Design a protein around this ligand. Structure first.
Ligand SMILES: Nc1ncnc2c1ncn2[C@@H]1O[C@H](COP(=O)(O)OP(=O)(O)O)[C@@H](O)[C@H]1O
Ligand SMILES: Nc1ncnc2c1ncn2[C@@H]1O[C@H](COP(=O)(O)OP(=O)(O)O)[C@@H](O)[C@H]1O
Ligand code: BEF
Ligand code: BEF
Ligand SMILES: [Mg+2]
Ligand SMILES: [Mg+2]
Lengths: 53, 381, 379
RNA sequence: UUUUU
RNA sequence: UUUUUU
């Protein structure tokens, strides 16, 4: 769960910076779709989202 | 008190049922149990997930007189996991009968462990799959000449298969001719009633011949039309919006089962898979963690399509169309156990997919609405 | 107040076109004397319009002759020379018979000779190295120049190599000419060096250096080790609203690495430094001034002269080497008295000594950065 | 698709 | 160090 909360911190920054610096709207939705999925579930170590880890 | 008292069961059996939390029997239990404990042969068909297992578990335990070193009850089914489920169910109802011993036998695990169990600690009740059981009988490790009760669960599927039918016939021959025979299923094709009938003398017949009542009117069942490419993306969106505790997703092959499970994992869906070809110890560990609610998403072949009783499965997915309306009715039944509410979503890909879904819609007098974009959380749980 | 200067009506028309409503202090003091052809040694506050002083004064005196170059302007960086040339075009909007040209290294010299031979300008802006090369091979004729301008003159003459090149360029020019030099910093030691190029010039000095600070700038610092610099900057770039920032480092290698790391944190950062090809340098410089990008990482190449309107924050990721560099660097933001923000990373004790040297010399306060600040107070 | 090897 | 024809 220490991985879970700190995975949310990396996404809450990528999403924040995407908004702040005019990112494509597809990227905003893709990040948010991943954030809400990570909250509804855990962090799977074999997932491709584990690239950042 | 009231309810289960009508049967006059053994007190240690009734104390077990109390610890199970059951309050009143289902119609199949009220109708079938009192005759079953008399020794009668029974051919039983009843609504999916309505308590068929407890019927033959309670009746065999009621009639059972334990004889040390002697197997008196044989129960068989079509999948290894189902035999495992039935064995543990025997354990929970024999909780207050310490002398009763139960064992389960199936392939994928060393036969010497099964042999060592038989020759060192012989059970009174044996549950298992036709292959391993027949192997142990030919082995002479399993002495089947003391059998007083012969039980088949999911019997129509077990007897629609001639290679499995001949195996159960060869197993049936090595048992005494005077004994109880009981067969259970939610589906009983009019073709296969005689096939089960040849195994019994004057059986009680529980039939739901007019299939108006085979539907689970506590389930909302919808469908979506889409391409194969759109199947994955639609599945991803549905798993995101729909709230659930557990989900079972059914595919039509081992290849599809492995690929979808891997694809779900890479999208950060904590999905597990179960199918033949896994090491048996591994698919037992994966069956248990799903049953113990340690995994939310299960992708399975038709291996998981019958008999599996998972408490918290809220949604059933037909990622691939079921082969027939028989397989459809059992897979959807994996949600909404004992008449609770649940959800069933079916993917219609090609012509044959809509062909089958119109068959099941007609056969059961059921409505399958096209899936709306918003569903009440109160609706399906 | 620009009417009183007695400028040419086209020149006055250009002033109103770019929106100037009132001359600055340095424009009031120097322009009338510079119109008359007097030598001027000018020191003035950062970003308060020194460029307009020598652009307008030379454009006023210019009597274009088709075959010859009359005004030469030099500075220390290529991008500053580019900026000055576009500033001449801006104020030559209504003087169509005036031609300007920029020559600096990193681009083919044959193209510079091509523009000289085929369409010779009246005003040349350049950097001393390329100008010297064009003058030695005789493509550039310096025998007609009547105005000789040095911008950022102290930095241009404190470099002995660059001073030697400027001196050789000067000796190729007529004795009868106007020489003007501009900067925001004029040390006691460098003033005679500038004066040796001039004859009885008007001298504009700022000897009370407390009025060289821009009181419209909020100036803070954070004590940090080099390990902690990277993410303190990351969070500051997240928290602070801004239109544009410039992030200064102490070396080309650090400029490349920090910019690359910022992009991988998905900050759309760009970098300018020596070693970038000049086409990439110019195109990168142009888009930053075109408001195409918000985050610029730079060496001291961008540390003085650069005039980008919407730079609200200036970051000292690495401590500037001395107080002059700090003064010019921090002044890339808040141009012409507007409000900006200045943040300096202090790494070791020597950095603190440099910071203390700065606040003593300018009698300015650099307080520690508070945890949250108001957006209006620096915008 | 499932059922000893 | 940074910057300045090569
Ligand atoms: N009388 C009862 N009251 C409540 N729950 C019951 C009763 N009988 C059985 N159940 C539960 O219903 C679930 C499904 O029973 P199961 O025997 O697997 O259904 P079937 O074999 O008919 O598909 C099981 O978890 C079982 O514990
Ligand atoms: N009178 C004025 N009113 C408004 N802005 C001015 C005025 N004079 C100059 N500026 C602007 O100030 C900005 C910076 O001037 P600049 O000449 O680069 O300052 P310095 O060279 O003294 O550091 C330029 O964008 C210029 O247009
Ligand atoms: F018919 Be049940 F689900 F075994
Ligand atoms: F001194 Be100014 F910023 F050119
Ligand atoms: Mg069952
Ligand atoms: Mg300037």
């Amino acid at each position: 769960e220490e991985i879970k909360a700190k995975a949310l911190d990396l996404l809450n920054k990528k999403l924040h910076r995407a908004n702040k610096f005019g990112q494509d709207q597809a990227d905003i939705d893709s990040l948010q779709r991943q954030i809400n999925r990570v909250e509804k579930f855990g962090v799977d170590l074999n997932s491709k989202l584990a690239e950042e880890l | 008190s009231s309810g289960f008292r009508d049967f006059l069961l053994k007190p240690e059996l009734l104390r077990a049922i109390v610890d199970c939390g059951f309050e009143h029997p289902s119609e199949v239990q009220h109708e079938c149990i009192p005759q079953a404990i008399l020794g009668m042969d029974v051919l039983c068909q009843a609504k999916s997930g309505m308590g068929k297992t407890a019927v033959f578990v309670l009746a065999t335990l009621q009639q059972l007189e334990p004889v040390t070193g002697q197997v008196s009850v044989l129960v068989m089914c079509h999948t290894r996991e189902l035999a495992f489920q039935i064995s543990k169910e025997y354990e929970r109802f024999s909780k207050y009968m310490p002398n009763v011993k139960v064992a389960v036998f199936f392939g994928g695990l060393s036969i010497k462990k099964d042999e060592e169990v038989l020759k060192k600690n012989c059970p009174h009740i044996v549950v298992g799959t036709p292959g391993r059981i027949l192997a142990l009988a030919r082995n002479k490790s399993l002495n089947l000449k003391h059998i007083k009760h012969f039980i088949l669960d999911e019997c129509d599927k077990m007897l629609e298969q001639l290679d499995m039918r001949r195996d159960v016939q060869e197993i049936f021959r090595m048992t005494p001719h005077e004994k109880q025979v009981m067969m259970f299923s939610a589906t009983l094709s009019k073709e296969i009633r005689p096939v089960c009938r040849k195994f019994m003398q004057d059986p009680m017949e529980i039939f739901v011949d007019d299939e108006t009542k085979l539907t689970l009117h506590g389930l909302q069942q919808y469908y979506v039309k889409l391409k194969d490419n759109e199947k994955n993306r639609k599945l991803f969106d549905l798993l995101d919006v729909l709230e659930f505790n557990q989900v079972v997703i059914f595919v039509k092959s081992v290849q599809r089962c492995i690929a979808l499970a891997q694809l779900l994992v890479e999208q950060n869906f904590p999905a597990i898979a179960i199918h033949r070809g896994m090491p048996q110890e591994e698919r037992l560990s994966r069956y248990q963690q799903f049953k113990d609610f340690q995994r939310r998403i299960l992708v399975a072949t038709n291996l998981f399509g019958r008999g599996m009783d998972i408490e918290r499965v809220n949604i059933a997915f037909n990622y691939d169309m079921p082969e027939d309306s028989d397989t459809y009715l059992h897979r959807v039944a994996r949600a909404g156990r004992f008449g609770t509410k649940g959800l069933a979503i079916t993917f219609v890909s090609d012509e044959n997919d809509a062909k089958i879904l119109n068959d099941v819609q007609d056969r059961f007098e059921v409505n399958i609405s096209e899936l709306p974009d918003e569903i009440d959380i109160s609706s399906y749980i």
